[PDB]
Amino acid sequence: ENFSGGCVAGYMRTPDGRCKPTFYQLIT
């Protein structure tokens, strides 16, 4: 909702409220 990125730089947010790294988002 809050478009600050998601979590960390390179970290998106999951529907759990936790963070996921977008590294495998670019490779997969």
Swiss-Prot record:
Superkingdom per UniProt: Eukaryota
Disulphide bridges: 7-19
Residues found modified as Glutamine amide: 25
Official protein name in the record: Growth-blocking peptide, long form
Residues of the full protein shown: 121 to 145 of 145
